[PDB]
């Protein structure tokens, strides 16, 4: 109940929590679907908390979880920093598209996972859902398409 | 869930702690703040982290961080953490069941060009959680920079 901060304000249709499901696949694994919940909140600052849990889509045992911090701009540039649960961290750095309603991420820094060169995230509302796309590059392979969901607003 | 048998000697911490701590730096004139950090667990070998701290006058939020506790079985802990500030932090260190404690000190600081490295050194005397936070920066040696006691709920 304090108010949206003016700098977060342009990412207001963020707020709330977002629950759906998510496919991996990556030329490593063989291809998985997950049930994802996102939750962005606030607390009058300048900055959006994020936090996240996945879970096996059949069992519904807890999977992975990730939490951290969305800090926009008023001149269209956004940083983010995450922990995971795996024990890795991101800063991302990007910008965020008021009229499209999209979020274009790529790490500026991958931390503590020295198989993980970069990773990208993309989000973008379409037809009121969140999606998303995480790309992941690594010693091995070229930056592609790692993770994508499509989450319902609760 | 149950608790992971790798969570089990850290299950102490597990709740909802509330307290307040002080800061001060050769740079910092001297600061009080209040403070809430959470514990949690799903049953995986790790422990979520999230913290909050409000000005003591007015009760305006003030700074927020989360992350995991990752402890291993041979006394070993690795904690991933993102600041409302902008930091990352990878820290590594080890707990002590005897002691009740657990010492970190960061192998990463990410996003933060003048801090060099930080420590976390948490406590558990007399049933309340005490921490110091040692911190370094490009021209100061690694000091003490924030004390806290926190009460459980």
């Given at each position: ?10 990412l207001?249709?963020?707020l709330?929590?977002?629950?759906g ?30 936090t996240?849990?996945?879970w ?7 999977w ?5 911090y ?7 540039s956004?940083?983010?920093?995450i ?6 961290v ?6 965020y ?8 991420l790529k ?7 020295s198989?993980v060169k ?10 009121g ?13 070229p930056?592609?398409?790692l993770?994508?969901?499509?989450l319902?607003?609760?």
């Amino acid at each position: 109940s304090p108010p949206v901060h003016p700098f977060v304000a342009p990412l207001s249709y963020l707020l709330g929590t977002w629950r759906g499901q998510g496919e991996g696949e990556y030329p490593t694994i063989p291809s998985f679907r997950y049930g994802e919940e996102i939750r962005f909140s606030h607390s009058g600052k300048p900055v959006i908390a994020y936090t996240q849990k996945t879970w096996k889509l059949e069992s519904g045992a807890p999977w992975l979880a990730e939490s951290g911090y969305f800090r926009p701009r008023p001149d269209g540039s956004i940083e983010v920093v995450i922990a995971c649960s795996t024990g890795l961290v991101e800063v991302q750095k990007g910008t965020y598209n008021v009229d499209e309603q999209s979020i274009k991420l790529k790490s500026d820094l991958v931390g503590n996972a020295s198989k993980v060169k970069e990773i990208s995230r993309e989000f973008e509302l379409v037809d009121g859902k969140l999606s998303y796309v995480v790309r992941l590059s690594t010693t091995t392979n070229p930056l592609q398409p790692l993770l994508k969901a499509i989450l319902d607003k609760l």
